[PDB]
Sequence to fold (1034 residues):
Amino acid sequence: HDAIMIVKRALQNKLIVAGGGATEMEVSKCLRDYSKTIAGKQQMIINAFAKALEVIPRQLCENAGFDAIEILNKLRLAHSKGEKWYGVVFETENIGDNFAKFVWEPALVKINALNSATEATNLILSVDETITNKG
Amino acid sequence: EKISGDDIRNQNVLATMAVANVVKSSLGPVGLDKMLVDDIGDFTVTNDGATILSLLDVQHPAGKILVELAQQQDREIGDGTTSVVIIASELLKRANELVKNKIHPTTIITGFRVALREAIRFINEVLSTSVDTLGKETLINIA
Amino acid sequence: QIIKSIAAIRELHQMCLTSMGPCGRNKIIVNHLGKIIITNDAATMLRELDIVHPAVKVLVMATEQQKIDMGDGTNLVMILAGELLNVSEKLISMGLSAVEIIQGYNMARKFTLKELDEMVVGEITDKNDKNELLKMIKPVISSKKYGSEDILSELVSEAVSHVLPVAQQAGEIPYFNVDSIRVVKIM
Amino acid sequence: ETVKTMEIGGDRVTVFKQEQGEISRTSTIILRGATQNNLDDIERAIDDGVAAVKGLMKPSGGKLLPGAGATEIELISRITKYGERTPGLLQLAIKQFAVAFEVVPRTLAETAGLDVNEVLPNLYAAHNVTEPGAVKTDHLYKGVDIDGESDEGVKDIREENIYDMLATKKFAINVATEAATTVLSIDQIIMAKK
Amino acid sequence: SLHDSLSVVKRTLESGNVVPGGGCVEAALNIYLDNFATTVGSREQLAIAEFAAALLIIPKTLAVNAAKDSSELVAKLRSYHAASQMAKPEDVKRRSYRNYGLDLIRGKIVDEIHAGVLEPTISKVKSLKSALEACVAILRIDTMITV
Amino acid sequence: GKGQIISNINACVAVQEALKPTLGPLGSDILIVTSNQKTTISNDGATILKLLDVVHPAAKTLVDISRAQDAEVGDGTTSVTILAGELMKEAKPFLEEGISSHLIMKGYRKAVSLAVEKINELAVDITSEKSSGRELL
Amino acid sequence: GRQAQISNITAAKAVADVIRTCLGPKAMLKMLLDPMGGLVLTNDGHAILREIDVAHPAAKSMLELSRTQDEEVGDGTTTVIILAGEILAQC
Fold:
């Protein structure tokens, strides 16, 4: 029954990406390399967006007991060198491949959340005045 | 009085930041000068950042370190008095975010010492003997 | 006292300066019914805001002239009228009475309106074609929700062409109506 | 002719429409989206969009002028020309009348993230040139560019087919002058505690 | 007045070791410390990353007095040197050029080697060594006792 | 002016700092006591934000996008608020240097277009591997 | 910050505030109140400036620059301060 429930959620959504910080670290790394043509005031804005994407794996390691300081330094070294599929193990702290452990996450969760976080951010940054009427 | 913890750490950064923000206007030849008024009421006008820190009156233990930093720079070279203060003050500004990250100050100091000696060999690949003396002259634009 | 009347409008002047234009920004205004309402159009925001200054209500009533008789210029009338008071402070400091200031604008208004007839290069043939209506409708739909003006252009141009009846060589009888187009929205 | 029931936005609703016969002047624009607040501005943008169709009638509905900062800068050169032409004390008010139009391109540069020292001198040099001839040449259509793309400078606003209708611009000038006239004509006010 | 103009070249050529100025030293070290921070780790990567970005305040301050946008000059300066370091360790280059500086007079990015702005290395090493020596003594004080 | 944006940043961080420990299946849970005196404990962030009912518009905006995340999808309700709030913190020092908020908004939009393009590349879709609906699962 | 630039323009205007009517052959007479009870009714522009006690240091710079012009030429002392004072007002 446990094996059926794992493949059940994978059949509903055919778009699957590697979780466990793998995809989160690669997106932040690619934006820093492509920022060379984004050079100018638009470069530092996207460079901060890549750093803002690191809060997701942080709280996951802090809530599980792992040290968020050491896990981020060792993950980037193993991600940039060799294979990019190396993630963070959720049981025992160590470098590992989530694609090897067959632990997957649906991509539509991160895609819909990325557009919703950016759209809601543009609404708040655009408000220079707020008036609240009583009633 | 005795003050410890992160309260005195933030005051030391804001004190050096206030001293740094005064001399940031005189950096470079295009920079702006300033007037230093004493208790008598007189003043002076100069664009040299080395003479400003000597005549500037600031009461603070780290502020006097910057005064000794300016005195040591003039006895060795004499150029970059404003630059050496801004670089030293910028590291104190970024050290604030490292405190909220639970980073120990020794690792902050050790990380800078390793990066200092490592950057020495990086300059060796940068620095080079005088070249470009054939086919063109780069000495004509210096003067 | 003439400066204090400008400072009261200046408080709401900077809000409208960030409105007009495709890069403009939107302000959140909480309605008295406990519902968050945000919009670019100033004529809608000025109604929900509580303004106790009577001098500001002059620009509010002047804004309704842009909303009712026209379909554009609600953000433009607040920027133009607000700047005329700022440039007038230089003449007040010099000791010039408000008569020559008002008389100067009336003489300059007739000079500007006369030149507007020479500022027109092309003229719309009023063909009411689907591709021809995209030229007039696009700038009006613009300056709100930037980036969606290309898709919303085909939706408005197709609905207007359906309201307009087929006729030729008759300009006496009006055709289009504002209330004849009702927009629906579903989450 | 036709009454059916279709799914709009995920819910089953009965649609009321037709095809050819019994020509009707009523139309409906269907909108869809996830955000509820974004659907309010798009709905209000259509109401302001269809209201411009009323201005397409005989009273100068076909005439047009370039917008996005193109006309506001070009009118400054004509107003300053009439300043020295008209003698008397009106010279002070005419010169300040053209300066008051510089706020439109300034806000477009500030709301776009562009520097104030950049867009303003570039617009003056574009609309002021020395042409060996009486007929004006080159391009008077230069507006305020959004930038954030391409390389540098501005571009012809006619490329994007964006312009301000004369009925909107000409009627807005008369309202703007009468709005500031009332404020400048009131030298005293009397209010009460509210 | 000629003696003042000759003293600029004589004192510059007096030291056989010179490096390009105008922000070339601070920008070059920023790229080298980025890849070096990943090769060490052990909680020291965050300190090197902040120490590398701290060198960009010198060209940013000069851009303020030059009326030019600091976000345009500093950000593009980092991308120009980072693109030139791609083929640098390979000992081969085609379109890759180094020594991209900043001109405060003309407000444009030009080569400082052709511009004629040079500073000796002796002033470079003693500047970064004395700046950190004074910075460590400040961070080592956790308590202020005033009698 | 620009000072109101800074006040809105702290409003999103105050909501984020409460939802930071709630990220993950092993994360902490928030205990909210309503004025009705009924105390409930929920792991998912939707119900947590529904009981608060924050009057502040920027904090309420994060609640609306969280309800839509739990409705149309059902996963990522806590992560969408943390990501949107942390993005506000990176734009806070940019306003102090004189950078306008418009290019900051348009700067993040350019990064999303490059990020979504890389998501489809990092995804795993096998075609020529000579597989079927079973061997993959 | 920007506060010192405002005080520099304000100090230059405060010095020129006294000599506003002191320019030209029609210049009127000024009354300087001394703390000891004395008064100076002379209408000379540069003769009053030496007895004016100022606080902001930029006001002392205007007195030193006007003293140099007073030695070279006898007139035009108040002309330079008014001309340079109005530049900061327009700028």
